[PDB]
Amino acid sequence: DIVLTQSPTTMAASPGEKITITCSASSSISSNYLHWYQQKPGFSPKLLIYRTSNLASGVPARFSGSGSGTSYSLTIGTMEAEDVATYYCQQGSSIPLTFGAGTKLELKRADAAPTVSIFPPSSEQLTSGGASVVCFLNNFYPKDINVKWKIDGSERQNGVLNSWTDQDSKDSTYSMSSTLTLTKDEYERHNSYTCEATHKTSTSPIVKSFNRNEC
Amino acid sequence: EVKLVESGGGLVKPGGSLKLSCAASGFTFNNYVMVWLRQTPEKRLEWVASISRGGSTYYPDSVKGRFTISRDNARNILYLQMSSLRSEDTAMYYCVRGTTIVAGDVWGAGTTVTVSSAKTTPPSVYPLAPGSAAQTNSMVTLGCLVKGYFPEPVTVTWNSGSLSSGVHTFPAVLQSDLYTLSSSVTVPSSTWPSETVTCNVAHPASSTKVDKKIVPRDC
Numbered sequence: 001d002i003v004l005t006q007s008p009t010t011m012a013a014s015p016g017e018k019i020t021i022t023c024s025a026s027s028s029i030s031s032n033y034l035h036w037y038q039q040k041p042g043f044s045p046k047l048l049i050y051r052t053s054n055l056a057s058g059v060p061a062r063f064s065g066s067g068s069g070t071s072y073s074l075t076i077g078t079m080e081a082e083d084v085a086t087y088y089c090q091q092g093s094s095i096p097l098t099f100g101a102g103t104k105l106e107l108k109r110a111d112a113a114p115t116v117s118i119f120p121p122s123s124e125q126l127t128s129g130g131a132s133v134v135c136f137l138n139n140f141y142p143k144d145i146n147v148k149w150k151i152d153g154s155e156r157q158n159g160v161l162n163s164w165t166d167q168d169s170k171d172s173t174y175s176m177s178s179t180l181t182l183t184k185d186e187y188e189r190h191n192s193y194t195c196e197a198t199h200k201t202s203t204s205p206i207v208k209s210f211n212r213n214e215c
Numbered sequence: 216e217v218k219l220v221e222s223g224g225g226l227v228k229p230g231g232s233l234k235l236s237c238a239a240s241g242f243t244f245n246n247y248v249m250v251w252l253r254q255t256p257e258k259r260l261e262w263v264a265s266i267s268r269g270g271s272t273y274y275p276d277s278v279k280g281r282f283t284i285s286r287d288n289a290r291n292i293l294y295l296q297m298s299s300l301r302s303e304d305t306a307m308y309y310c311v312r313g314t315t316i317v318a319g320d321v322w323g324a325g326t327t328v329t330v331s332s333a334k335t336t337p338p339s340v341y342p343l344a345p346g347s348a349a350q351t352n353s354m355v356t357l358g359c360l361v362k363g364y365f366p367e368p369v370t371v372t373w374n375s376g377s378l379s380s381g382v383h384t385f386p387a388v389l390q391s392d393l394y395t396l397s398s399s400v401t402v403p404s405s406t407w408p409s410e411t412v413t414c415n416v417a418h419p420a421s422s423t424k425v426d427k428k429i430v431p432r433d434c
């Protein structure tokens with residue numbers, strides 16, 4: 001069965017920059033049956049390139065493709081913001097049909113620090129018997145970021161769950177959500193709750209806190 | 216406007232059965248190989264089944280014996296009959312039109328299948344307001360934490376759709392057979408609490424819709 005190995009896994013490109021991504025097959029495959037799809041976040045994949053090098057309908061001329069044998073590539077002549085997407089290669093000369101795992105293209109832009117906000121458990125939730133503490137880390141670049149929770153000034157790792165947005169279409173930044181969940185009883189055995197974000201845009205962490213007995 | 220519209224996807228138990236439909240329009244359906252693909256939660260694409268113009272079917276070993284693709288060249292409809300389902304069959308299913316060189320040139324919007332023993336559960340919707348002691352300046356950020364629902368999806372709007380800029384609604388995370396997501400909105404500091412902020416959370420599968428106004432935290 002053909003394995004298609006795409007690289008790189010993820011790639012960041014400056015506007016105007018020439019971009020080349022590669023698809024490598026486990027055995028020689030026929031080039032008339034090698035195609036590329038583009039998938040924008042929240043949309044279906046769409047045929048982008050067929051038969052190694054033929055641009056599909058609607059596809060701007062800055063795209064192209066080439067290769068033969070075990071080795072194929074897709075090139076974008078000048079990166080545009082509208083090109084932010086995951087690209088998949090696919091072979092159809094052997095059953096079972098198979099796909100590469102995709103290369104995600106992202107746009108470079110100026111560094112931007114996260115705006116950070118912490119939120120205590122609502123009374124509604126405590127009544128139910130639980131306590132979630134939420135920290136938002138919004139609109140930062142680049143995407144690498146680290147969040148540390150502390151309770152009463154000690155690091156806390158269990159009960160934390162993180163979620164990340166896709167790169168934002170309007171400003172090219174990323175955003176993150178971090179939720180620390182406790183039982184009401186445990187939440188009521190401590191006073192101070194803190195989230196700290198470490199990001200390259202500052203030499204000390206951003207720290208946001210609250211106290212269970214505040215006014 | 217060639218178009219493919221998938222329907223029938225939803226929640227089913229492991230071992231269950233489910234039939235997906237794909238309604239084709241704007242081209243001559245009887246002249247094309249038609250195909251089901253699926254995209255896993257990990258965003259991996261997988262071939263599920265093909266069917267020739269003449270009804271010859273093909274499958275990878277993963278679903279062979281379990282899924283049956285069929286077609287009705289007269290109503291212009293493609294089917295996928297699923298049975299013996301597993302959690303790993305959980306995915307978004309795409310109806311795709313095949314070409315003679317084994318590319319897919321037309322794709323539907325997709326229909327979502329969740330194979331799980333978890334029960335349908337409405338979300339609890341909690342407000343996220345800044346602590347009573349929080350300090351000011353310029354922009355405020357508020358939120359809704361939408362917790363303990365099943366299955367996907369929910370949809371959140373702010374102010375029945377009025378507020379849309381400055382929103383980040385985060386992908387859901389699953390733990391012990393339940394989903395949680397949060398959504399944040401950022402609005403001008405003077406604009407709140409003056410300008411009412413409410414999140415609206417709809418949960419189709421539960422016939423649930425709720426609204427939560429974000430009230431300032433107070434002594």
Ligand SMILES: CCCCCc1cc(O)c2c(c1)OC(C)(C)[C@@H]1CCC(C)=C[C@@H]21
Pocket residue numbers: 090092095097248250252265267273311312313314315316317318319
């Ligand atoms: C996204 C990829 C879509 C591929 C669509 C596609 C096109 C296509 O021509 C075929 C497909 C799949 O499946 C196999 C199983 C190779 C069928 C063998 C029988 C005939 C007549 C055609 C083959």
